[PDB]
Amino acid sequence: PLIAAASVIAAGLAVGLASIGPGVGQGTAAGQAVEGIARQPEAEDKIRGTLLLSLAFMEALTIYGLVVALALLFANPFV
Amino acid sequence: PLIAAASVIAAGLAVGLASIGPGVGQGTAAGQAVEGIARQPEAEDKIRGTLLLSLAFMEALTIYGLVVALALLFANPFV
Amino acid sequence: PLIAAASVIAAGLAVGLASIGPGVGQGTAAGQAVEGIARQPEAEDKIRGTLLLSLAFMEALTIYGLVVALALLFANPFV
Amino acid sequence: PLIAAASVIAAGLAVGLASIGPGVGQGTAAGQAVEGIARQPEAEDKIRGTLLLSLAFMEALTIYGLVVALALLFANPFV
Amino acid sequence: PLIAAASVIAAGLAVGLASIGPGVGQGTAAGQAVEGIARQPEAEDKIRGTLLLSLAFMEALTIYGLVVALALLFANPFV
Amino acid sequence: PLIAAASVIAAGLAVGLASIGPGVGQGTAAGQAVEGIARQPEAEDKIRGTLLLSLAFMEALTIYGLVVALALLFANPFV
Amino acid sequence: PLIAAASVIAAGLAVGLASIGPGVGQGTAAGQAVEGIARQPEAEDKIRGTLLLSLAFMEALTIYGLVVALALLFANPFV
Amino acid sequence: PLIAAASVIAAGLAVGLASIGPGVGQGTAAGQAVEGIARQPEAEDKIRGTLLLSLAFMEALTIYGLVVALALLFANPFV
Amino acid sequence: PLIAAASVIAAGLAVGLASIGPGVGQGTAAGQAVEGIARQPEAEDKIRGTLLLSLAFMEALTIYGLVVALALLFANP
Amino acid sequence: PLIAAASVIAAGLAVGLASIGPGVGQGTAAGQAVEGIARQPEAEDKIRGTLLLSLAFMEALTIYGLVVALALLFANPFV
Amino acid sequence: PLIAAASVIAAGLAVGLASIGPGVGQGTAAGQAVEGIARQPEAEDKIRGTLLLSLAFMEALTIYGLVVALALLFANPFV
Amino acid sequence: PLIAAASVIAAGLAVGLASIGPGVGQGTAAGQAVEGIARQPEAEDKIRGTLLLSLAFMEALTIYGLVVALALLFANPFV
Amino acid sequence: PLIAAASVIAAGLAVGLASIGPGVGQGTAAGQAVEGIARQPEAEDKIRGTLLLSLAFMEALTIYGLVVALALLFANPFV
Amino acid sequence: PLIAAASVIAAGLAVGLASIGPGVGQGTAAGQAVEGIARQPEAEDKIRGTLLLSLAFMEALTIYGLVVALALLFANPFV
Ligand code: NA
Ligand code: NA
Ligand code: NA
Ligand code: NA
Ligand code: NA
Ligand code: NA
Ligand code: NA
Ligand code: NA
Ligand code: NA
Ligand code: NA
Ligand code: NA
Ligand code: NA
Ligand code: NA
Ligand code: NA
Ligand SMILES: [Y+3]
Ligand SMILES: [Y+3]
Ligand SMILES: [Y+3]
Ligand SMILES: [Y+3]
Ligand SMILES: [Y+3]
Ligand SMILES: [Y+3]
Ligand SMILES: [Y+3]
Ligand SMILES: [Y+3]
Ligand SMILES: [Y+3]
Ligand SMILES: [Y+3]
């Protein structure tokens, strides 16, 4: 009844809000990672390795909001 | 009844909010990726490769909000 | 009844919010792509190619909010 | 009844919100496109071509909010 | 009844919100267009031409919110 | 009854919101137009001409919110 | 009854919101107009003339919110 | 009854909001007016004259919100 | 009844919001007024005079929100 | 009854909001006042005198919100 | 009854909001106070004295929100 | 009943809000960590070690919002 | 009854909001404190002493929101 | 009943909001701590020690929101 309607919105906002910060975060990090590559091309293969560890780290932040959204939609215990 | 109306809005806000951050994020990253190419054209083929890995990474952030929006509209378990 | 009124607003906000971030994102990227062209005109044909891949990438972000908005208005399963 | 009142507001906010980001986006891009022309007048005919592809790209973002607003007002399936 | 009161507010917010972004956008673009003219007066007649194409482009963004506002007030199909 | 109270607030917010962006926009543009005049006084009569075309352009943005506000207060079709 | 209470708040927010943007706008413009005078005192009588045309332009933005506020309080047609 | 309670809040927000923008605006302008005086003390008597015309201009913005607030509290026509 | 409860909140938000902008405004102006004094100490007595006219000007902005707040609390109505 | 509950919240928000702006304001002013002292230690006793007049000026802004909060809590005329 | 529930939230927001601005304010001031010490270590004992007077000044801003919060919780006259 | 619907939303917002700040935080830190590596490649193995301790530190911030979200969904004491 | 539910949320927002500003504040201060140490390592033991006095000062700001939150949860007089 | 539903949301927002500021704060501090290490690798072991004291200090800010969230969920006195 109500719970079915409630968990369904919490599934929308969980993934809706989660992408706000990291969406911005990965942006500055990647862009600033590129500018450095442009400045020092010889450091490229060395540079991405950090940007990669970095991008994955922030990508996990929106994953938690994605997982809880699905645990709300599919694996919901309360309905 | 109510759930049908609730999941339908959560489908709107999920994809509505998801695009906010990465929309900004990809912007700074790409633009800053271009400026570097302008500075060092010889590094172009080397530069995009990072911008590409970067753009895809952030593009996945709005995908989660797109997928949940569809799982709300079409594949909805609660209706 | 209610669902018809609910899905109709979720169609408005889906496309309303989707344009916020990428609208800003494409702005900085394009403008910064132009400044570099002004600095290095000889790199133009090389520059746009990245800005193009970039602009399309962000243009897809508002497409998801456009598609869900239409799937809400026209192809709505819940009404 | 309600749907007629609901779709009518969703038509207002769809075009209301859509203009926020790109309104800002085109601003920075164009202004930054001009500054470069001032710096390098000889690159003008070369510069606008990118700014044009850019401005149209962002102009499409508010079009989606305009189209859905009209599809809400005029060709509204739900009323 | 309700629809008459609903479409009347959607007419207020449509033109209310539409001016936010482009109001800021045209500002930076024009101001930055002027600074460049001050720097290079000889480029003036060449500069405005881009600022003009630019200003009109963003002016169209608030037009969509103006048109829908009027289509809500005067040409309203739902009342 | 209600419509009279509804159109009356939409008249308040239409002109209330419209001034936000352009109020900021004209500010940066004018101020940046002055700084350039200070830098190059000889370009003054050449400079204002662009600032004038610019200021009017943004002044029209708040006019649309002013006109709709009046069309709501005085020329209201719905009351 | 209600309309009297509604138009009375719309009179408060009309003048409340109108001052936000231009309040900021005139600030940057004037301050930046002064800095230029400090840099080039000899350009003073030439500088203010633009700042004056500019300040008045933005002062008109809050006038529209002031006029509608009064047309709501005193000259109200709906009460 | 209601109107007495409504006009009383509109009196609070009218003067509450009015001070937001100009409060910020006068700040940047004055501070930037001072820095210029520090840079060029000999221009002081010449500088304040612009800052004075400027400060008064923005001070009028909060006056409109003050006047309407009082016209709501004391000279209220609707009560 | 209601009006007594309504005017009482409008008294809270009037002084609550009024301090937002000028609180920021005086901050930049004063701080920027100080930096200039540090740069040119000899201009001090000349500098404050403008900062003073400036600070008072912005201080009046929160006064209007203070006065209306009191006219709501005491002199109500 | 209601008034007792209403004046009690207005006492919370009066002091809650009052500290926002000046809290930021004193911050920039003080910090910028110290950087100058670091740059010119010999000007210290001369510098603080302005920072002191400045800090007190902004401290009075939160005092008005503190006084009204207390006049709401203790000296309340309406209960 | 209601007042007990009302004063209890006003106690939460009073101390909740009070820390926003000064929390930011002390941050810039202190950080900028240390950068100057790094630049001129010999001025340290002279520098902190201003930062101390400054930090206390802003610390008093959150005290007013703390005191009113307690006067709401413990010394509450209205319950 | 209600608690089941309440804890379900608190599970959505807990993980929704938690990612906002650190999402931005890790972004600036990582990106700034990369730029330094580009500047000094020889410091890379030395640099990441700090960025790693840093990234984990901020990653724990969204973990608390993830854990409470799950403790709300799965091991919920109140239902 | 209600008070128990009211004081329980005020306990959540008190500690929820309190961390916003100082969380940002300590960030800039510490980071700026580190950059100075990097610039002048010899000043380290001298530098932290100010950063320590500074960090504690801001840490007290979130303590007030923590204490009131607990005084709401545990030592609550109103239930 | 209601308290069980109320304390459950206050548990969500307490950790939801707590991470906003420090999430940003640790970001700037850490990133700025690494840039300095890149500039002066020899200062590394000296640098982290401050960044560590700093990171922990801000990490405690989200701990208070985590603890109260748990004291709301598990150790709740009011249920
Ligand atoms: Na850089
Ligand atoms: Na760059
Ligand atoms: Na640049
Ligand atoms: Na530039
Ligand atoms: Na420039
Ligand atoms: Na400039
Ligand atoms: Na300047
Ligand atoms: Na300056
Ligand atoms: Na400066
Ligand atoms: Na400075
Ligand atoms: Na500096
Ligand atoms: Na840098
Ligand atoms: Na610096
Ligand atoms: Na730096
Ligand atoms: Y190289
Ligand atoms: Y070249
Ligand atoms: Y040239
Ligand atoms: Y000169
Ligand atoms: Y001179
Ligand atoms: Y000197
Ligand atoms: Y000296
Ligand atoms: Y009692
Ligand atoms: Y090196
Ligand atoms: Y009891």
Author numbering:
A (entry chain N), B (entry chain M), C (entry chain L), D (entry chain K), E (entry chain J), F (entry chain I), ...: 3 to 81
I (entry chain F): 3 to 79
Which lines from the publication concern this structure?
We isolated the c-ring of the FOF1-ATPase of the green pea (Pisum sativum) from a native preparation, crystallized it, and determined its homo-tetradecameric structure at a resolution of 3.4Å. The crystal structure of the c-ring from P. sativum shows a concave barrel shape with a pronounced waist in the middle, exhibiting tetradecameric symmetry consisting of an inner and an outer ring. The proton-binding site retains a chemical coordination similar to that of the alkalophilic cyanobacterium Spirulina platensis, including the same amino acids: Gln28 and Glu61, located on TM1 and TM2, respectively, of the same monomer, and Phe59 and Tyr66, which are positioned on TM2 of an adjacent monomer. Glu61 is likely to be protonated in the structure, which was crystallized at pH 4.5, and this notion is supported by a pKa analysis. One contact region consisted of loop-to-loop interactions mediated by yttrium ions, as indicated by strong electron densities. A galactolipid was tentatively modeled into the intercalating electron density, in compliance with the notion that the uncharged heads of the galactolipids enable their penetration through the thylakoid membrane, as was demonstrated in the crystal structure of cyanobacterial photosystem II.
ATP (adenosine tri-phosphate), the general energy currency of the cell, is supplied mainly by FOF1-ATPase (ATP synthase). This enzyme is composed of two rotary machines, FO and F1, which are coupled by a central rotor and a peripheral stator. The c-ring of the enzyme's CFo portion consists of 14 copies of subunit c, and is embedded in the membrane.
